[PDB]
Design a binder for this molecule. Structure first.
Ligand SMILES: *[C@@H]1O[C@H](CO)[C@@H](O[C@@H]2O[C@H](CO)[C@@H](O)[C@H](O)[C@H]2NC(C)=O)[C@H](O)[C@H]1NC(C)=O
Ligand code: NDG
Ligand code: NAG
Lengths: 497, 497
């Protein structure tokens, strides 16, 4: 329907401007006849998910690199893509006037949008909140009667989550992650810094931290929202580092293991939410395969765990083979899921860089790499932030895909947003990654998956400056002749039958 | 040269039998000397455009009826006259022996015939086809790889058009019209029934439908044929009716308006055929002025519409003033044009009355009405039918100026043929209707036009049983004393210098 309204801010590309009466959107998707492919392009130079089409001819006039689809080579199945509804995000969003709010949600969740089917939901305050609270801050309340939900959950997170699910293309799943417990179960009695839970797994401190997990669940359920999964903690490696500034609860791998085993798992198991899946190690990729080795090799924990959740900090190198690769090898039946990613901390980079293509590229390179190493789903950090890059009670240190300019009632869509969309919109839940063979060495990143209905989808990223001539072969349909422009991103689709 | 060979089938008048060795034909056209007028005469009693000549008098003594030419009451200029090359027609025409054919084509297109200067051409199958087909029946071919012309076009319609042009000496203009789009573009997936273009204008369905016109014109260009104009759709209103039996595609006027502005207009504009004119509403009179108001008050639609096309059901009433007149008043610069007419649609009447005089009169009466109300030219329906009024695949049979009996290798020219001829032969493209006031109430239908060379033509029709004596005054030259025999049609021509 409506194209991108560009705006430069002195970066290598532009964002797209939406206010309360215009936003760039998509038409109900079409499915071109067997023999016909669809392409979506976004370029640094300015193009933004633009639909074009062409032939899958059975001749082969292309003499460069070949990408051969190998549909019989079958890999993991996809949970889906989304991002987190942090206090920050909820606040920045409700700054906007209601019509702007809807153009915004639609952008993320609608078919006119990019089809998010996941929302990560922090359990009380995190660094991206305007205050440090938990759901039971009243002291020595061990059976949890003053367990309540603040204005924050009741007015901000929850009604937006409802609206998000109304607009949604597809069914949406919900993920929870606690940052810190009530401070009267902490070795340090403080929402941050080197301070774990009190006593040892099994004891009453440990048993209450588990009941809070259940309570959060009942509480969100009165408002009629069920969770697909919860993480055991967000970033527990962090609570062992003295002077950690954000809300954090320490857990050595050995500690998480025994906690899940004796407390979290059994408590969850015995409750009406026994179907909510538990995820472990909600923390950085360099903590694997070790953390997995420790938690899962003990039978009594492992039987509760459904997946391992990881974090991409896109400012840092971290070899996938040695981390995720090795992790799948050691437990091929244990799913890998990416529960947070963000970029913007390099001290010398503005936290929010409006129209940064490099950052979009970094995003996609990260998701592709993800799926080539067995990952079932990728989840962004904040849905929306301000131009400073907040509101964060400690410091802005990360960008976001949508930035909200409250003073001008407009909001902007970063190259990030579209580099994500090239995946989330075209890989429904149930899709399965399938083989895809390069004919030769190439400066491109590629990935191929297969829709539920059995149609193909291949994302191609170019991070070099040079254009790249490319042929994608599909054994059933024939050859798809194309060029992949420098600094670009294509998502190709087609029927196979 | 050769006169009509008459034969009767028990109706009020005769047909002119023609075969492979004989057909009634005209001498090469001449002009009356200044001071003399020319007459062509057709009568129920058997005279078939008989040529005679007589003097223009200096003075006139009388109390009887007086038609006064008003050379300065200048009105619409004239595009011309012709008829439609439907599959049915081509098929009938092409099933006679070759010399039977040439004679049939010359009957319509030569100077020794009635010199048609328009052929309307259906873009694929109508109800006067023997099979349903589009040019793009492969489903979801949004790119129209498999767009093409089947035999109906390539061995029937085109060859016959080339031959028709060859024989014609006035330049012939072609007009093209689609009944249905491919079925994958339509909401109901059928060639018939309530249905329309999917989605909304500016979308992919609408963009394709547009491209289809251009492909259409591409293909006909490759066979060295250019079209003067196309219609936005044949009988759009019909596509809006539950149960509709034959090829169609339904537009509300808003739909048609928006389609024209957003898709059809631009697409034609950005192509080699931009010169091709575009006519809106290829439907019945009662839709005016409404449809006219809806399309023509939107300037993004108006800039594309070169005129308004109307269908004339002769068995059926419409008030000329409240329809055409009013429309001319609102849009004097959008030409009215008649794209179709037929007799024998109405449920209770026979499709073919061979030799029906009553039918010819119904023709000229209403072609004169057309001219009186700013219609710039006229296009009959099927050039040739069979004695059933077909073939037609929903059995939607109706009459035709020429009826072909293949078992006898013989075709029959009807009163309609000559009734049309009285106009088509004597009103070259560029003629301008002028005023003609009567001196008193009277049973005649008349019309006056001036040719491009400056000389006069007046058609006089008598639908009463009684001879009317009358005089035509033209101040430049004098008086024509004549009689309109009862149940007759006369065409008069004279120089003015
Ligand atoms: C076609 O029509 C012509 C004219 O009607 C027919 O020839 C005439 O009819 C009879 C038969 O010989 C003769 O008395 C006349 O000499 C003919 N008249 C003229 C003007 O030619 C002829 O029979 C028909 N042709 C065919 C092939 O059936
Ligand atoms: C509410 C508002 O100020 N909208 C402006 C509007 O005039 C403009 O045409 C559109 C595209 O830039 O969005 C912006
Ligand atoms: C369309 O046309 C091409 C070339 O003429 C042909 O090889 C192909 O098989 C056709 N496709 C379909 C779907 O009919």
């Amino acid at each position: 329907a409506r194209p991108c309204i560009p705006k430069s801010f002195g970066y290598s590309s532009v964002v797209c401007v939406c206010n309360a009466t215009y936003c760039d959107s998509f038409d109900p998707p079409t499915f071109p006849a067997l023999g016909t492919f669809s392409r979506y392009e976004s370029t640094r130079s300015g193009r933004r998910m633009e639909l074009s089409m062409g032939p899958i001819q059975a001749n082969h006039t292309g003499t460069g690199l070949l990408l051969t689809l190998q549909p019989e080579q079958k890999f993991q199945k996809v949970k889906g893509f989304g991002g987190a509804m942090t206090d920050a995000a909820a606040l920045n969003i409700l700054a906007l006037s209601p019509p702007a709010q809807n153009l915004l949600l639609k952008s993320y969740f609608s078919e006119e949008g990019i089809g998010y089917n996941i929302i990560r939901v922090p359990m009380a305050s995190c660094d991206f909140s305007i205050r440090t609270y938990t759901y039971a801050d009243t002291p020595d309340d061990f059976q949890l009667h003053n367990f309540s939900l603040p204005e924050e959950d009741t007015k901000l997170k929850i009604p937006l989550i409802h609206r998000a699910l109304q607009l949604a293309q597809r069914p949406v799943s919900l993920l929870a992650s606690p940052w810190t417990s009530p401070t009267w179960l902490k070795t340090n009695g403080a929402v941050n810094g080197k301070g774990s839970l009190k006593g040892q797994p099994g004891d009453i401190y440990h048993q209450t931290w588990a009941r809070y997990f259940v309570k959060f669940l009942d509480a969100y359920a009165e408002h009629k929202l069920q969770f697909w999964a919860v993480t055991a903690e967000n970033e527990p490696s962090a609570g062992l580092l003295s002077g950690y500034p954000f809300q954090c609860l320490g857990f050595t791998p050995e500690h998480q293991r025994d906690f899940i085993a004796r407390d979290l798992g059994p408590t969850l198991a015995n409750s009406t939410h026994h179907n909510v899946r538990l995820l472990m190690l909600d923390d950085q990729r360099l903590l694997l395969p070790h953390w997995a080795k420790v938690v899962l090799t003990d039978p009594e924990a492992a039987k509760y765990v459904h997946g391992i959740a990881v974090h991409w900090y896109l400012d840092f190198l971290a070899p996938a083979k040695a981390t995720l690769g090795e992790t799948h090898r050691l437990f091929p039946n244990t799913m890998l899921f990416a529960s947070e990613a963000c970029v913007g901390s390099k001290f010398w980079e503005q936290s929010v860089r409006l129209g940064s293509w490099d950052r979009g590229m970094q995003y996609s390179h990260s998701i592709i790499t993800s799926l080539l190493y067995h990952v079932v789903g990728w989840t962004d950090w904040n849905l929306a932030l301000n131009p400073e890059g907040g509101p964060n009670w400690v410091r802005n240190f990360v960008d976001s895909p949508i930035i909200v300019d409250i003073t001008k009632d407009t909001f902007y869509k970063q190259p990030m947003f579209y580099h994500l969309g090239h995946f989330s919109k075209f890989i429904p839940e149930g899709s399965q990654r399938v083989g895809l063979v390069a004919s030769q060495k190439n400066d491109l990143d590629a990935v191929a998956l297969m829709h539920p209905d059995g149609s193909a989808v291949v994302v191609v990223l170019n991070r070099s400056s040079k254009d790249v001539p490319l042929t994608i072969k599909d054994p059933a349909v024939g050859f798809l002749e194309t060029i992949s422009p420098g600094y670009s991103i294509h998502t190709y689709l087609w029927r196979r039958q």
